[PDB]
Design a protein around this ligand. Structure first.
Ligand SMILES: *[C@@H]1O[C@H](CO)[C@@H](O[C@@H]2O[C@H](CO)[C@@H](O[C@@H]3O[C@H](CO)[C@@H](O)[C@H](O)[C@@H]3O)[C@H](O)[C@H]2NC(C)=O)[C@H](O)[C@H]1NC(C)=O
Ligand SMILES: *[C@@H]1O[C@H](CO)[C@@H](O[C@@H]2O[C@H](CO)[C@@H](O)[C@H](O)[C@H]2NC(C)=O)[C@H](O)[C@H]1NC(C)=O
Ligand SMILES: *[C@@H]1O[C@H](CO)[C@@H](O[C@@H]2O[C@H](CO)[C@@H](O)[C@H](O)[C@H]2NC(C)=O)[C@H](O)[C@H]1NC(C)=O
Ligand SMILES: *[C@@H]1O[C@H](CO)[C@@H](O[C@@H]2O[C@H](CO)[C@@H](O)[C@H](O)[C@H]2NC(C)=O)[C@H](O)[C@H]1NC(C)=O
Ligand SMILES: *[C@@H]1O[C@H](CO)[C@@H](O)[C@H](O)[C@H]1NC(C)=O
Ligand SMILES: *[C@@H]1O[C@H](CO)[C@@H](O)[C@H](O)[C@H]1NC(C)=O
Ligand SMILES: *[C@@H]1O[C@H](CO)[C@@H](O)[C@H](O)[C@H]1NC(C)=O
Ligand SMILES: *[C@@H]1O[C@H](CO)[C@@H](O)[C@H](O)[C@H]1NC(C)=O
Ligand SMILES: *[C@@H]1O[C@H](CO)[C@@H](O)[C@H](O)[C@H]1NC(C)=O
Ligand SMILES: *[C@@H]1O[C@H](CO)[C@@H](O)[C@H](O)[C@H]1NC(C)=O
Ligand SMILES: *[C@@H]1O[C@H](CO)[C@@H](O)[C@H](O)[C@H]1NC(C)=O
Ligand SMILES: *[C@@H]1O[C@H](CO)[C@@H](O)[C@H](O)[C@H]1NC(C)=O
Ligand SMILES: *[C@@H]1O[C@H](CO)[C@@H](O)[C@H](O)[C@H]1NC(C)=O
Ligand SMILES: *[C@@H]1O[C@H](CO)[C@@H](O)[C@H](O)[C@H]1NC(C)=O
Lengths: 121, 100, 558, 35
């Protein structure tokens, strides 16, 4: 069974950095792209970025460049995302997702549990 | 930039009525649109992998079709279990969502 | 009035995938014997070719078949006592290893790069380190006889198949191609491994040819195929003295003993004028695909050293250039290129390549490689013949940010096996005639059905009838024998043009003889009568069974 | 050689041993329960 297990909710102050992890179990980690999707509380789904765990390639969206770092630890099959310079507008549910096939990676069939990040004073 | 335009923003329907949701891409030239049923508190679920092809584990009551910059998603009779926000997606671009 | 006539040897082919064999592996012939197919247009798809998957498998198999009979550095996965090289970038590491006689030990000192070591304790006096990834897998030392100079590989067909080259000088890679040629073997393709920049490739005949599977998403690699090469010259100026120790019965470990003279960083020189002219033309060609957008080139946004730097093999040494002074430009729709003044310059762009020795081979994880040092210095020249770009996705203010990419080595081989398609010949077919019973390979592929029914003994003879090749020889034999058995069951054994007693049904095709034999090619005919071959073949075998029983009845009458 | 005691923390024994670790210069002490 393919599963994605993400870390629990976290609370940060403006200007802090938050690290979110997405343990991946059930499949070959180094053959599929992992997409990190940010769900604003009531404003829809922002794609934000993809990581390729084979060589660690990343493609951060042109909005979240400079603030969203993605990394991967293949020895424990876990992906990591870091978001710096948090602002109150960054409160959202951060989702880890994978495509059904390596050839077509946008068909986000497999999703983990949402990680709630709250930014407030 | 490929802006997704999704309508209606709010759809009022009872059990058994036919539900029609539209999504208008800014640029298409490819039948690559996905539809996501998001239940409150849960991560979205993929129903229509590709513009028309259906996803395993989804009953036949869900369907859709289209091409280019104009796609249509339908439900052949709304069920009590089908209350969700439906989103369209093309590549990294997500729509605004339709609350059903 | 029209009857089914069975033809064998028709210039008809279908798409298929076979295990084409290299030929540096088998000596090549004088010429590829290219037959240009007039009036033939075929659909290519560079991003779904199998010749690339086969080349990838061949390369990851030849490489892993040359390090098998080589020393494995198991005895060197020991704690190292490393100090600074002040006799960081390099460390002077002392260790106690195993010697040839399996009862003694040996003390040695080698100079390793800091990128090759991982601390076992807080890094500072000596500190403890081990070789990178030595506690996760075995590190295999390359034998001194391993050839690190790419050797051109020619892919030749097995019997029964053909390679359809594309000679349209402005083809991107996907879509219909005219002026299609048939060849027996490909040109010499060098298995050059390089990231971000394609080296020692073939240049575009006419202009810069931007090619991608879909220039609308941000996942597919964008390959820029250049028309004029930019020359890059890379060097390791350090004068190294190589020492070696024996770590087993005939297992010799080679390492850098000392360095003569000063310590200088490795670097690569690219002329500023030629690079920025290249990037100007690539920015104008990319403006033809993303109209009214701003085109920017920036450095990679993340990843491992193998994809954030320019990785290449220079006389065995594995360099890793920064390439952030190259990819720094903005081109706007007004036609002005921002970092201007680079068209009358004499400057050079010095890229500080780093050197690494324990190279994580491909991405197998469970197999590394040690590149032994070479005494003296190293200089390599190469031609930059293309770029690997990745486009940044998401919302933007009408600006594209094309950042270098790579790592996946299929996109380095999809830039020289772009014009080649593999097809399987279908020499057996049927067509209506008035007949009742009672040059080169594929040269006529574009000719009409009445001018291709004379060149049948030429596409028939070229059917030519370890495990990877032997299975395709057996498969070719099986296909030949199945076609012969079909002809025999139909009563057509020993004939290339066979008239039968099955009438033509107008529901199969209602075209007249002057609309088929005189106006259509055999490919168009196959595309027409294809849903009906399971009916025609059954009718042919039933008619032959009736004729055989009538013949034995006539031959028993007397 | 294993140094095995009874599992009173027979059918199973609590065996201590000195084995080789990942780095080919150190050793490792471990304890396992074997039948
Ligand atoms: C791209 O192609 C060029 C030219 O084919 C390659 O550079 C050439 O590499 C070979 C093999 O490393 C060099 O020959 C060697 O020379 C040394 C010293 O003379 C000798 O000891 C070796 O046995 C061998 O003959 C050759 O000189 C060199 N050419 C130039 C002009 O520098 C280049 O490496 C290729 N690039 C890639 C990334 O594969
Ligand atoms: C690397 O370190 C070794 C010692 O670990 C150095 O070798 C010693 O160099 C001194 C120089 O005065 C000699 O007197 C010693 O006899 C050498 N020892 C051995 C065991 O050979 C070596 O010179 C250092 N090399 C570099 C390049 O820093
Ligand atoms: C291989 O050895 C390296 C170096 O000892 C290990 O990396 C360390 O692992 C420990 C595990 O507790 C970490 O706390 C250290 O921070 C790591 N050090 C560095 C410099 O990264 C590595 O984990 C070992 N490999 C395996 C598979 O255990
Ligand atoms: C098996 O034996 C080992 C010792 O060989 C026991 O481990 C010790 O358990 C005591 C319990 O009080 C601890 O205080 C020691 O620190 C432990 N030693 C080590 C090295 O871990 C172990 O508990 C025994 N287990 C069973 C199931 O009998
Ligand atoms: C080699 O072995 C000796 C044994 O006394 C030890 O003192 C020394 O530190 C060892 N060398 C290294 C580099 O660990
Ligand atoms: C190559 O293909 C393009 C596709 O538009 C076509 O316009 C062009 O004429 C072709 N070139 C040749 C030499 O056939
Ligand atoms: C490549 O050329 C074909 C010719 O039919 C065209 O349809 C396709 O859009 C082109 N693609 C790119 C990425 O240039
Ligand atoms: C077709 O390719 C051949 C290859 O030799 C070339 O000579 C010929 O001029 C090409 N024709 C066109 C129309 O591009
Ligand atoms: C690169 O250019 C610099 C300019 O200072 C020069 O010193 C160096 O020798 C050149 N390197 C090569 C390999 O040509
Ligand atoms: C290249 O050098 C710049 C210098 O500022 C540095 O920031 C960058 O990280 C380096 N890139 C790589 C891939 O090491
Ligand atoms: C390195 O130094 C040695 C000894 O001085 C000398 O013989 C050799 O030619 C030098 N090599 C280079 C490449 O400078
Ligand atoms: C680069 O290409 C030019 C094209 O004329 C050629 O003369 C030169 O030898 C090539 N250089 C290398 C290093 O292959
Ligand atoms: C290709 O078509 C032209 C059309 O004029 C014709 O003259 C020529 O003979 C044809 N070539 C072949 C090989 O069928
Ligand atoms: C492990 O090695 C030590 C070395 O002093 C020894 O005393 C001990 O008995 C060994 N352990 C076992 C289980 O044999």
């Amino acid at each position: 069974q393919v599963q994605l297990v993400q870390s629990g909710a976290e609370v940060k102050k403006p200007g802090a950095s938050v690290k979110v992890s997405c343990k991946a179990s059930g499949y070959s980690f180094t053959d599929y792209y992992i997409h990190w999707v940010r769900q604003a509380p009531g404003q829809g789904l922002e794609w934000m970025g993809w990581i390729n765990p084979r060589f660690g390639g990343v493609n951060y969206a042109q909005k979240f460049q400079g603030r969203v770092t993605m990394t991967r630890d293949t020895s424990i099959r876990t992906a990591h995302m870091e978001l710096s310079r948090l602002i109150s507008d960054d409160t959202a549910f951060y989702y880890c997702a994978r495509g059904r096939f390596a050839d077509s990676v946008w068909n986000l069939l497999f999703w983990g549990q949402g990680t709630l990040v709250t930014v407030s004073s | 930039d490929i802006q997704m335009t999704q309508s209606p923003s709010s759809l009022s329907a009872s059990v058994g009525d036919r539900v029609t949701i539209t999504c208008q891409a800014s640029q298409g030239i490819s039948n690559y649109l996905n539809w996501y049923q998001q239940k409150p508190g849960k991560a979205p679920k993929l129903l229509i992998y590709d513009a028309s092809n259906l996803e395993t584990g989804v009953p036949s009551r869900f369907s859709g079709s289209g091409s280019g910059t104009d796609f249509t998603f339908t439900i052949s009779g709304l069920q009590p279990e089908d209350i969700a926000t439906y989103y369209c997606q093309k590549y990294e671009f997500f729509g605004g969502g339709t609350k059903v | 009035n029209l009857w089914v006539t069975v033809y064998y040897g028709v210039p008809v082919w279908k798409e298929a995938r076979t295990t084409l064999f290299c030929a540096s592996c088998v000596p090549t012939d004088p010429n590829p014997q290219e037959m240009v197919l007039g009036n033939v247009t075929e659909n290519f798809n560079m991003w779904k070719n199998d010749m690339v998957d086969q080349m990838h498998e061949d390369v990851i198999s030849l490489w892993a078949q040359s390090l098998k009979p080589c020393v494995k550095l198991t005895p060197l996965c020991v704690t190292l006592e490393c100090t600074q090289v002040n006799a960081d970038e390099m460390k002077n590491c002392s260790f106690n290893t195993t010697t040839e006689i399996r009862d003694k030990k040996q003390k040695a000192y080698a100079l390793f790069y800091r990128l090759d070591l991982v601390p076992l304790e807080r890094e500072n006096s000596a500190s403890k380190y081990i070789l990178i990834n030595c506690n996760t897998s075995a590190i295999t030392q390359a034998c001194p006889k391993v050839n690190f100079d790419p050797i051109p590989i020619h892919y030749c067909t097995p019997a029964g198949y053909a390679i359809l080259k594309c000679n349209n000088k402005t083809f991107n890679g996907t879509g219909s191609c005219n002026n299609v040629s048939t060849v027996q073997c490909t040109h010499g393709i060098k298995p050059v491994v390089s990231t971000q920049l394609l080296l020692n490739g073939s240049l575009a005949e006419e202009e810069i040819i931007i090619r991608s599977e879909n220039l609308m998403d941000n996942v597919k690699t964008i390959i820029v195929h250049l028309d004029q090469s930019v020359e890059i010259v890379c060097t390791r100026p350090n004068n190294n003295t190589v020492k070696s120790i024996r770590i087993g019965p005939g297992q010799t470990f080679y390492y850098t003993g000392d360095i003569i003279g000063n310590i200088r960083e490795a670097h690569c020189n690219i002329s500023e004028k030629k690079w920025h002219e290249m990037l100007r033309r690539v920015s104008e060609k990319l403006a033809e695909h993303f109209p009214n957008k701003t085109i920017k080139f920036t450095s990679s946004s993340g990843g491992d050293l193998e994809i954030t730097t320019h990785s290449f093999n220079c006389r065995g040494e594995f360099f890793y250039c920064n390439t952030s002074g190259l990819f720094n430009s903005t081109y706007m729709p007004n036609g002005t290129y921002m970092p201007n003044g680079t068209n009358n310059s004499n400057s050079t762009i010095i890229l500080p390549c780093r050197i690494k020795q324990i190279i994580n081979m491909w991405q197998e994880v469970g197999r590394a490689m040690y590149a032994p040092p070479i005494a003296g210095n190293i200089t390599c020249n190469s031609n930059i013949t293309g770029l690997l770009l990745v486009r940044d996705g998401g919302k933007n203010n009408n600006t594209e940010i094309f950042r270098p990419g790579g790592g996946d080595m299929r996109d380095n081989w999809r830039s020289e096996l772009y014009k080649y398609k593999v097809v399987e010949i279908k020499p057996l077919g049927v067509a209506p005639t008035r007949c009742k019973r009672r040059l080169g390979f594929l040269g006529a592929a574009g000719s009409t059905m009445g001018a291709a029914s004379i060149t049948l003994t030429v596409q028939a003879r070229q059917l030519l009838s370890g495990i990877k090749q032997l299975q395709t020889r057996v498969l070719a034999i099986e296909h030949y024998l199945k076609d012969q058995q079909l002809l025999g069951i139909w009563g057509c054994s020993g004939k290339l043009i066979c008239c039968t007693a099955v009438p033509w049904n107008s529901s199969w095709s209602n075209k007249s003889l002057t609309d088929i034999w005189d106006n259509m090619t055999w490919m168009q005919w196959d595309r027409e009568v294809s849903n009906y071959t399971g009916i025609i073949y059954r009718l042919l075998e039933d008619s032959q069974n009736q004729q055989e029983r009538n013949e034995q009845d006539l031959l028993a009458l007397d």
